[PDB]
Structure formats: structure tokens, C-alpha cells
């Protein structure tokens, strides 16, 4: 990379790097300032409290600064490594503590398919090729949001976008594309709701 | 009116040193024919250290048939006394072994003939009969068992009816308002979504 850079002049700050911790289950952002660091590619790696990679979304603001956002779905410490032109910036890694909120044990689960409710709770089987709506009623759980991750039979872990209804309930829309074992993790305020993670088998 | 508990002998499937299958009722025999006259008592603690019902039948001949239901996989600690005195070699430690695959069980709940889908829901009405059906066709060897924790903190075993087609029915009515915890196991292990937390309301 002939274009000169100096990663030691990059500065990072903002809510997503708060040394006092952040609330789990809420998306958060921070700013990376490379205006004095020359020209190079900015990369960010985030490891979650389980040591697994977490997506850091990077917005180039076109002025030498970047906005980075991530979703700490999980209580615990996240490990953030930032590189400019391939070189680590100072003071790495950032260790950011996502703190639990509310009472996940008060969340209730109902399931519906095609506009017909299967009543309460998520049994051990789901159907393939059929949109399934898992409603998490958190009206009694207090502070926090519902988050969801699905592991597919191939081993991939995918964060599912949870719809907030603003009445204390949250809807998880999922269509299982293939038969096999899925693991559906549902947290509220950073913590597993009752019976999560759900080990479910997708069937014809 | 003398007795000698040191001469009481104990044997049978319920005391098998190699373990017993969880979720199946089991019996054992206490032989006090050489031990004189006295009252037989049996205490069973389940793996969590809580009392487990021991049904004692006096056979009227110096022997007793004792039965208990190991609903939970794990270790059961059995203390037997005759005339108030311990018999030898106590306590007995009996392993209840898991069987089958409780994770393959399917639950359906019906109240007054209306299906509530899987699990109870957060609320039921006091005095209203509930029917919990457990489909265990895919679960392998074992039986469904059920224990309820009541608002007062008591534990009660709820009889489970075997239909001999792979399904089991549980009939339960909440008598008092408050929080209940319904534990449903197959072959010693929680079925999916057990234990079930329900508030009994007016």
C-alpha cells in the first residue's frame, strides 16, 4: 500500500466504546476518526462474549470519519479490534461490557403460522418453507429488547431482525429453508428467555 | 413387644445396585420375619433431596412390599427403619437411569375441549380441568411423569394415564389461585418447555 498512513493517529470514541458499559439488546454506534492518519483501509473485528465474530457495520462519512454500529445481543464483554492500513490502532483491544437489563424470565412465547395460532410456546418441530411467526411477549419483562439468532443445519449463525411492536411484544419472522436441526436463541435484555436456546427440528 | 432391626433383610428391583430405569414404578421387599414386632418406615429422598412417596403395603406375614416412582433421573437415598431403629447398611443409594429421548415429546393442552396449542399458556382458571397430552411415540423407551408445585410450596405427584399408543394424558385442576410449576418428564428428563410456569387466577 504505497499510500501513506499512520494508524497510531486514529482515534475512536462514542457510546459503543463506553468504558462504563452499555445496555445489552440495544444497537449502539461509535465514531472512528482517521482525519490525521493518512489513507488506508479501515477494518473492525468484534468478538462477542462467547468469542464468536460479530458484524461491525461501517459507514464511511466521506470526511475522514467513520460510524461503526453493532448489536450487543448478549450480556458480557465484547472485544473490538480496529486496524487502519492493516496496522492496529493504539490501546487495543477495546473491552466493552454489555450489561443485562429487565427480567427475561417474564417473557412469554406464542407461535403462529399462516395467521393461525399454535398457542403458547415453541415446540420441538417447525415446518419447512412456511413463514413462522414467533411472538415474544415482554410486557412484564421491564427494560430491554428481544433479540434472536438462528443456527442452521449447516452450522451458520445468523442474526434475525426482530420487529418491535411498541406494545411490549416482539415478532420474529423465520422461514426454515431446509429440513434439519436449527437452534433458535431468543434473548431479552441480554439474557435467554425461558427455554432458550430452542433446539428445533425442521420437518416436511 | 421386642424387635431387632439388625435382622431385617431388604431386596428387590427397587434396590438394584446396577440402577433402575427412570419414570417406571418399582417395588422392593422388606423381610422382617426374624425381627420381631414393630412399625416399618421408609424415607426416600429424590436427587434434589426432597421427599419421595414410599407406599408401604403390610403383607400381614412379616414382610412388606414398598413401591415408589423415580420420576427424575439421578440418585435416590432410601432409609428404612423398624420399630424406630435403622436396619443395617443404610442408606441405600439407587441410581434411576435416563431412558429414551424426552426431547422428541410433543405436548398439546386442552381446556374445556378447546386446544391451547403447545404448553399451558401463562394463565389458567382455578377449578377448571386441564388436559395435557404428551405424544411420546418418537421418544423410545420410558413413560411420562408429572409433578406439580403449588403456590404453598408443596409438591404433588400427578398420575399420568398411559394410552398404550405412545401418548399419555394428564388431568389436573388448580384448586387455589397463585403460581404453579408443572414439571413433565419422560424417561427421567424434562420434555420440551418443561417445567411449565402458570398463574392460576379466578
Q: Contact A111/A133 with Cβ under 8 angstroms?
A: yes
Rounded distance, CA A81 to CA A96, Å?
11
Pick A121's closest partner by Cβ from B103, B105, B118. Answer: B118
Three cell numbers, residue B61: 406375614
CA distance A136 to A117: 13
Grid cell at residue A121: 410456546
Partner residue facing B120 (CB), from A110, A120, A124: A120
Cα–Cα distances (Å) from B72 to A94, B137, B162, B189, in that order, read 46, 20, 18, 6
Handedness of CA B136, B139, B144, B145 (dihedral sign): negative
Closest residue in B to A195 (Cα–Cα) = B193
Nearest by CB to residue A119, choosing from B105, B116, B197, is B116
**Is B122 part of the contact surface with chain A (CB cutoff 8 Å)?**
yes
Q: Phi/psi of residue A38, each to 5°?
A: 80, -155
The 3-state secondary structure of A112-161 reads EECCEEEEECCCCEEEECCCEEEEEECCCCCCCCEEEEEECCCCCEEEEC
CATH code assigned to B5-97: 2.60.40.10
A72, three cell numbers: 450487543
CA A119 – CA A131 distance, rounded (Å): 16
CATH homologous superfamily of B102-200 equals Immunoglobulins (2.60.40.10)
Hey, which residues does A162 pair with through a beta bridge?
A: A172
The rounded distance, in Å, linking the Cα atoms of B131 and B115 is 9
Resolution of the experimental model, in Å, one decimal: 1.8
Domain with CATH 2.60.40.10 in chain B: 5-97, 102-200
| Length of chain B as a residue count | 202
Beta bridge partners of B185: B145, B190
d(CA B67, CA B52): 11
Helix, strand or coil, per DSSP, at residue B17: coil
By the 8 A CB rule, do A183 and A148 touch? no
Q: List the single residue in A with minimal CA-CA distance to B109.
A: A119
Beta bridge partners of A1: none
User: C-alpha dihedral over B4, B7, B13, B16, to 10 degrees?
Assistant: 110
Comparing alpha-carbon positions, the chain A residue that sits nearest to B105 is A124
Q: Which residue of B has its CA nearest to A112?
A: B117
Residue A39 has φ and ψ, to the nearest 5°, of: -115, 125
Q: Strands B20-21 and B92-97: what pairing?
A: parallel
- A122/B117 Cβ within 8 A: no
Collect all residues of chain B within an 8 Å Cβ-Cβ radius of residue A119.
109, 115-119, 121
Residue B182 DSSP one-character state:
E
Q: In this structure, which topology does domain A7-99 adopt according to CATH?
A: Immunoglobulin-like (2.60.40)
A96-115 residues touching B, CB cutoff 8 A: 108, 110-111
Q: Which of A108, A123, A199 sits opposite B118 (nearest CB)?
A: A123
Alpha-carbon distance of A20 to A4, in angstroms, equals 35
Contact between B116 and A118 using a beta-carbon 8 Å cutoff: no
CA dist B175 and B76 (Å) reads: 30
> Which residue from A39, A80, A36 is spatially nearest to A58, judged by alpha carbons?
A80
DSSP A100: P
Q: Is A59 exposed, middle or buried (0-12, 13-18, 19+ CB in 10 A)?
A: exposed
How far apart CA A173 and CA A162 sit, in angstroms, is 7
Interchain contact, A121 vs B116, CB within 8 Å:
no
C-alpha cell at B149: 408445585
- Say whether residue B197 is in contact with chain A using an 8 A CB cutoff: yes
CA–CA distance from B184 to each of A42, A110, A136, B33 (Å)? 53, 20, 23, 40
The number of C-alpha atoms within 13 Å of A5 and in the hemisphere containing its C-beta is: 19
Superfamily of domain covering A104-202: Immunoglobulins (2.60.40.10)
Tally A–B CB contacts below 8 A: 45
Which of helix, strand or coil describes residue B6? helix
Strand B123-125 to A191-192 pairing: unpaired
Question: Parallel, antiparallel, or unpaired: how do β-strands A162-164 and A22-23 relate?
Answer: unpaired
d(CA B5, CA B38): 9
Q: How would DSSP label each residue in B73-131?
A: SEEEEEEEEETTEEPTTPPEEEEEEP-S-GGG-EEEEEETTEE-BSS--SEEETT-EEE
HSE of A83, CA atoms in CB hemisphere, 13 A: 7
**In the block, residue with C-alpha cell 434411576:** B96
CATH 2.60.40.10 in chain A, residue ranges = 7-99, 104-202
Structural biology method used: X-ray
Cα A109 from Cα A118, distance rounded (Å)? 11
Output the nine-digit C-alpha cell for B158: 400427578
B25 touching A (Cβ < 8 Å): no
Amino acid at each position: 500500500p504505497l499510500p501513506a498512513h499512520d494508524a497510531s493517529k486514529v482515534r475512536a470514541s462514542g457510546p459503543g466504546l463506553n468504558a462504563s458499559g452499555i445496555p445489552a439488546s440495544l444497537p449502539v454506534e461509535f465514531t472512528i476518526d482517521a482525519r490525521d492518519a493518512g489513507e488506508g483501509l479501515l477494518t473492525v473485528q468484534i468478538l462477542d462474549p462467547e468469542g464468536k465474530p460479530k458484524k461491525a457495520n461501517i459507514r464511511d462519512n466521506g470526511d475522514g470519519t467513520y460510524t461503526v454500529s453493532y448489536l450487543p445481543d448478549m450480556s458480557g464483554r465484547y472485544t473490538i479490534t480496529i486496524k487502519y492500513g492493516g496496522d492496529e490502532i493504539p490501546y487495543l483491544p477495546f473491552r466493552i461490557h454489555a450489561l443485562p437489563t429487565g427480567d427475561a424470565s417474564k417473557c412469554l412465547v406464542t407461535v403462529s403460522i399462516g395467521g393461525h395460532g399454535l398457542g403458547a410456546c415453541l415446540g420441538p418441530r417447525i415446518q419447512i418453507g412456511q413463514e413462522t411467526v414467533i411472538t415474544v411477549d415482554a410486557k412484564a419483562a421491564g427494560e430491554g429488547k428481544v433479540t434472536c439468532t438462528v443456527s442452521t443445519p449447516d452450522g451458520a449463525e445468523l442474526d434475525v431482525d426482530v420487529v418491535e411492536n411498541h406494545d411490549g411484544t416482539f415478532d420474529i419472522y423465520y422461514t426454515a429453508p431446509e429440513p434439519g436441526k436449527y437452534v433458535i436463541t431468543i434473548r431479552f435484555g441480554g439474557e435467554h428467555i425461558p427455554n432458550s436456546p430452542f433446539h428445533v427440528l425442521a420437518t416436511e
